[PDB]
Symmetry: C2
Subunit: 123 residues, 2 copies
């Protein structure tokens, strides 16, 4: 009864440069015969003041998506090649391929999520 | 002070066949000079027992991603060409291009989300 169209074995924690524990992926390049994007992320309520990674880079563009049940329920700081940016939920920020970046949770409620959508199949 | 790398004007509600209110997009094909995927969705806590759409189709493959703060905090029913499937968070389900489908929220907590990731730039 494993259904080839359904993946329940999630997240998929992958070692990523800059991270100190594996990053939680929900879409990987090897799913469903091959995907054109990857997607990692997670719930932020326990991460306020606790960054997941140091400044790091990807060979592909990556979009951050920040959501929370209440409008403005979550806020993150993003460093983009050394320049601080902030996002207030809901928001999306583009991180160009090669840009040294990371994010920090400054505010979150139960149900705040940040996802990174990697526009390619390599890390 | 609009930053070209940040979109705060979200969601973007788009008219979609089968839906009775516009669907909330967070990534659209026209963002950042052109994106190769689109992404729509939202928080499910108020949607238990309330479907967003009738059976409908897309010209591209679409991946459902279901997450919730607690393991198993959310459950959805997906109809795939008339066959009922269920997803327990966290889960991902592939919906092939052309497949008549829809989902129904059967259980959700504060912070449950379902997103559809459309693998292309057309609807
Ligand atoms: Zn099936
Ligand atoms: Zn840590
Ligand atoms: Zn990154
Ligand atoms: Zn800037
Ligand atoms: Zn409705
Ligand atoms: Zn659909």
């Amino acid at each position: 009864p494993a259904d080839p169209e359904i993946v329940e074995g999630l997240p998929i924690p992958l070692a990523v440069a800059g991270h100190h524990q594996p990053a939680p992926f929900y879409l990987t390049a090897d799913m469903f015969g091959g995907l054109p994007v990857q997607l990692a992320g997670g719930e932020l309520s326990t991460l306020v003041g606790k960054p997941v990674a140091a400044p790091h880079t990807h060979p592909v563009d990556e979009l951050y998506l920040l959501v929370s049940p209440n409008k403005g329920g979550a806020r993150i700081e993003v460093q983009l090649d050394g320049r601080r940016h902030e996002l207030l939920s809901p928001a999306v920020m583009r991180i160009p391929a090669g840009s040294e970046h990371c994010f920090l949770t400054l505010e979150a409620e139960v149900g705040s999520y940040c996802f990174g959508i990697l526009l390619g199949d390599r890390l």
